[PDB]
Amino acid sequence: SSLALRLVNGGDRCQGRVEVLYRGSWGTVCDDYWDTNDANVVCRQLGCGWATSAPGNARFGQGSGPIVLDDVRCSGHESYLWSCPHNGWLSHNCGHHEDAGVICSASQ
Ligand SMILES: [Cl-]
Ligand SMILES: [Cl-]
Incomplete structure (x- = not known):
């Protein structure tokens, strides 16, 4: 029940770097695989419309x-x-240079 998602550093609630709250801490998501299916789930969960892109x-x-x-x-x-x-x-398989992001339709 504590899990949560946000987008940061994108200048709008509905675009930015994906972060998930896990075990007390906001963490990032590696783009080793990242696509617009993933972005669409993010955009929907946040009430930000649909993904227009999923930049890694x-x-x-x-x-x-x-x-x-x-x-x-x-x-x-x-x-x-x-x-x-x-x-x-x-997993500790990635570095922060692989942090995934999303741009959603609701971003302004
Ligand atoms: Cl939010
Ligand atoms: Cl947790």
């Missing part, structure tokens, strides 16, 4: 928190990003 490679900067998720492979209609298939939690 720390486009919205590198987080400082733990990298909590990687290999996230949503189908696209999941209600929460954590409900999508993913490679457990806290």
